[PDB]
Design an enzyme around this catalytic site. Structure first.
Site, mmCIF file in Angstrom:
data_model
loop_
_atom_site.group_PDB
_atom_site.id
_atom_site.type_symbol
_atom_site.label_atom_id
_atom_site.label_comp_id
_atom_site.label_asym_id
_atom_site.label_seq_id
_atom_site.Cartn_x
_atom_site.Cartn_y
_atom_site.Cartn_z
ATOM 1 N N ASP A 139 0.887 -1.213 -0.069
ATOM 2 C CA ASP A 139 0.042 -0.078 0.010
ATOM 3 C C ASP A 139 0.864 1.198 -0.106
ATOM 4 O O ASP A 139 0.394 2.159 0.501
ATOM 5 C CB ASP A 139 -1.093 -0.040 1.002
ATOM 6 C CG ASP A 139 -2.014 0.923 1.117
ATOM 7 O OD1 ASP A 139 -2.376 1.424 0.046
ATOM 8 O OD2 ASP A 139 -2.596 1.425 2.067
ATOM 9 N N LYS A 142 2.019 2.415 -6.324
ATOM 10 C CA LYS A 142 1.720 1.727 -7.280
ATOM 11 C C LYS A 142 2.832 0.815 -8.251
ATOM 12 O O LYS A 142 3.239 -0.207 -8.559
ATOM 13 C CB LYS A 142 0.700 2.033 -8.273
ATOM 14 C CG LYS A 142 1.246 3.436 -9.055
ATOM 15 C CD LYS A 142 0.023 3.929 -9.989
ATOM 16 C CE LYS A 142 0.539 5.071 -10.995
ATOM 17 N NZ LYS A 142 0.342 6.147 -10.366
ATOM 18 N N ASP A 167 -3.555 -3.265 -1.819
ATOM 19 C CA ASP A 167 -4.467 -2.319 -2.113
ATOM 20 C C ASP A 167 -4.576 -1.624 -3.463
ATOM 21 O O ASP A 167 -3.452 -1.729 -4.127
ATOM 22 C CB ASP A 167 -4.314 -1.083 -1.038
ATOM 23 C CG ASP A 167 -5.577 -0.275 -0.897
ATOM 24 O OD1 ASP A 167 -6.539 -0.624 -1.138
ATOM 25 O OD2 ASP A 167 -5.446 0.996 -0.526
ATOM 26 N N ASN A 168 -5.468 -0.836 -3.904
ATOM 27 C CA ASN A 168 -5.442 0.075 -5.067
ATOM 28 C C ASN A 168 -5.031 -0.746 -6.284
ATOM 29 O O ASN A 168 -4.693 -0.047 -7.244
ATOM 30 C CB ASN A 168 -4.476 1.206 -4.668
ATOM 31 C CG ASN A 168 -4.944 1.954 -3.486
ATOM 32 O OD1 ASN A 168 -3.910 1.890 -2.669
ATOM 33 N ND2 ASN A 168 -5.959 2.726 -3.191
ATOM 34 N N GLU A 197 -11.387 4.389 -0.581
ATOM 35 C CA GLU A 197 -11.510 5.074 0.534
ATOM 36 C C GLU A 197 -12.483 6.294 0.435
ATOM 37 O O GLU A 197 -11.885 7.308 -0.222
ATOM 38 C CB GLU A 197 -10.336 5.062 1.365
ATOM 39 C CG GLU A 197 -9.348 5.953 0.702
ATOM 40 C CD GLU A 197 -8.228 5.332 0.083
ATOM 41 O OE1 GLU A 197 -8.703 4.096 -0.627
ATOM 42 O OE2 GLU A 197 -6.985 5.553 0.107
HETATM 43 N N1 LIG Z 1 9.174 3.072 -1.234
HETATM 44 C C1 LIG Z 1 8.310 3.342 -0.379
HETATM 45 N N2 LIG Z 1 8.946 2.960 0.901
HETATM 46 C C2 LIG Z 1 8.074 3.053 1.784
HETATM 47 N N3 LIG Z 1 7.182 3.798 1.939
HETATM 48 C C3 LIG Z 1 6.709 4.393 0.775
HETATM 49 C C4 LIG Z 1 7.413 4.181 -0.227
HETATM 50 N N4 LIG Z 1 6.936 4.775 -1.373
HETATM 51 C C5 LIG Z 1 5.784 5.477 -0.574
HETATM 52 N N5 LIG Z 1 5.713 5.257 0.352
HETATM 53 C C6 LIG Z 1 4.780 5.765 1.605
HETATM 54 O O1 LIG Z 1 3.563 5.073 1.414
HETATM 55 C C7 LIG Z 1 2.351 5.674 1.722
HETATM 56 C C8 LIG Z 1 1.240 5.315 0.969
HETATM 57 S S1 LIG Z 1 -0.324 5.680 1.945
HETATM 58 C C9 LIG Z 1 -0.120 4.231 2.954
HETATM 59 C C10 LIG Z 1 -1.755 4.214 3.826
HETATM 60 C C11 LIG Z 1 -1.651 3.198 4.776
HETATM 61 N N6 LIG Z 1 -1.192 2.058 4.364
HETATM 62 C C12 LIG Z 1 -3.060 3.251 5.445
HETATM 63 O O2 LIG Z 1 -4.080 2.600 4.654
HETATM 64 O O3 LIG Z 1 -3.490 3.765 6.344
HETATM 65 C C13 LIG Z 1 2.892 7.121 1.977
HETATM 66 O O4 LIG Z 1 2.959 7.462 3.442
HETATM 67 C C14 LIG Z 1 4.136 7.395 1.468
HETATM 68 O O5 LIG Z 1 5.183 8.131 1.884
HETATM 69 O O1 LIG Z 2 -0.160 6.476 -3.496
HETATM 70 C C1 LIG Z 2 -1.129 5.892 -2.683
HETATM 71 N N1 LIG Z 2 -0.417 4.982 -1.857
HETATM 72 C C2 LIG Z 2 -1.450 4.119 -1.039
HETATM 73 N N2 LIG Z 2 -2.457 4.227 -1.118
HETATM 74 C C3 LIG Z 2 -3.204 4.904 -1.995
HETATM 75 C C4 LIG Z 2 -4.600 5.062 -2.047
HETATM 76 O O2 LIG Z 2 -5.179 4.113 -1.170
HETATM 77 C C5 LIG Z 2 -5.142 5.924 -2.678
HETATM 78 C C6 LIG Z 2 -4.521 6.889 -3.452
HETATM 79 C C7 LIG Z 2 -5.234 7.662 -4.586
HETATM 80 C C8 LIG Z 2 -6.533 7.232 -5.078
HETATM 81 C C9 LIG Z 2 -7.149 8.223 -5.832
HETATM 82 C C10 LIG Z 2 -6.830 9.561 -6.012
HETATM 83 F F1 LIG Z 2 -7.453 10.530 -6.737
HETATM 84 C C11 LIG Z 2 -5.385 10.002 -5.442
HETATM 85 C C12 LIG Z 2 -4.742 9.135 -4.814
HETATM 86 C C13 LIG Z 2 -3.199 6.820 -3.661
HETATM 87 C C14 LIG Z 2 -2.495 5.865 -2.934
HETATM 88 CL CL LIG Z 3 -14.386 3.855 3.241
HETATM 89 MG MG LIG Z 4 -4.000 2.608 -0.366
#
Ligand SMILES: Nc1ncnc2c1ncn2[C@@H]1O[C@H](CSCC[C@H](N)C(=O)O)[C@@H](O)[C@H]1O
Ligand SMILES: O=c1[nH]cnc2c(O)cc(-c3ccc(F)cc3)cc12
Ligand SMILES: [Cl-]
Ligand SMILES: [Mg+2]
Length: 213
Positions: A139, A142, A167-168, A197
């Site tokens: 998560d 991508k 996720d996603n 979400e």
């Molecule tokens: N290569 C990487 N290693 C570790 N963290 C990363 C990364 N690339 C992006 N991220 C971190 O990935 C997160 C995506 S959002 C994570 C949401 C969390 N899992 C939840 O559901 O509550 C961001 O905080 C971002 O800084």
């Molecule tokens: O980059 C993301 N990392 C992890 N989780 C994500 C996640 O749950 C949603 C989205 C997100 C989805 C739609 C949008 F319009 C903009 C951002 C990004 C991340």
């Molecule tokens: Cl939700």
């Molecule tokens: Mg996500």
């Protein structure tokens, strides 16, 4: 202050210390009524809870911590002595996640690792005394999902039955990762359709169970 700092402060002022479910509800309320944020959320979170309870993993790896929502969600359902490691590249977010877990009373179950997934993964065996992982929550970003899955395999961290939960896979979408797991004999895959979400937009989770080389 930042959005993430506002989420933490909202928790602090609208949840009960030591009560994970109150923390999740507060985050969900803020992100529904005030400011959207990329927490896995409640719709997908309920699918995640279902998975966690099915497998009762002893050692979970999360890639991407953000504010700690998913770490709270997973760690509240772990058995005593089970553990979650979570990797977070952004140091501000890592500090929020720690404080969120602390507030929730889950800090003894969770280790937050401040760094990039692709740098930390190679250090899990020697530095974090890991043998193999029972579950991975992907998560973070991508474009890292495929490379980091392949790295986890290379580093000998997957075993037969390790559960990858991604996720996603629809929004933002992870086409390379999905095509790879779905077409590989090394993975047994199931798709869990849901919603992004806090949004009326289709999204989903992919479960990919490692089956060995
Ligand atoms: N290569 C990487 N290693 C570790 N963290 C990363 C990364 N690339 C992006 N991220 C971190 O990935 C997160 C995506 S959002 C994570 C949401 C969390 N899992 C939840 O559901 O509550 C961001 O905080 C971002 O800084
Ligand atoms: O980059 C993301 N990392 C992890 N989780 C994500 C996640 O749950 C949603 C989205 C997100 C989805 C739609 C949008 F319009 C903009 C951002 C990004 C991340
Ligand atoms: Cl939700
Ligand atoms: Mg996500």
């Amino acid at each position: 202050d930042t959005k993430e700092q506002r989420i933490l402060r909202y928790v602090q002022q609208n949840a009960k210390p030591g009560d994970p479910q109150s923390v999740l509800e507060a985050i969900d309320t803020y992100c529904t009524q005030k400011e959207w944020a990329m927490n896995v959320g409640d719709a997908k979170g309920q699918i995640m809870d279902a998975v966690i309870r099915e497998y009762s993993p002893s050692l979970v790896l999360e890639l991407g911590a953000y504010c700690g929502y998913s770490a709270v969600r997973m760690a509240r359902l772990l058995q005593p002595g089970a553990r979650l490691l979570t990797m977070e590249i952004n140091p501000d977010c890592a500090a929020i996640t720690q404080q969120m877990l602390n507030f929730a009373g889950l800090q003894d179950k969770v280790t937050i690792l401040n760094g990039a997934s692709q740098d930390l993964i190679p250090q899990l065996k020697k530095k974090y005394d890991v043998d193999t992982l029972d579950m991975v929550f992907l998560d973070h970003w991508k474009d890292r999902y495929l490379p980091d899955t392949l790295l986890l395999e290379k580093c000998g961290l997957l075993r037969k039955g390790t559960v990858l939960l991604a996720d996603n896979v629809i929004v933002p979408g992870t086409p390379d990762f999905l095509a790879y797991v779905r077409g590989s004999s090394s993975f047994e895959c199931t798709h869990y359709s849901s919603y992004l979400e806090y949004m009326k937009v289709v999204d989903g989770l992919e479960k990919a169970i490692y089956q060995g080389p």
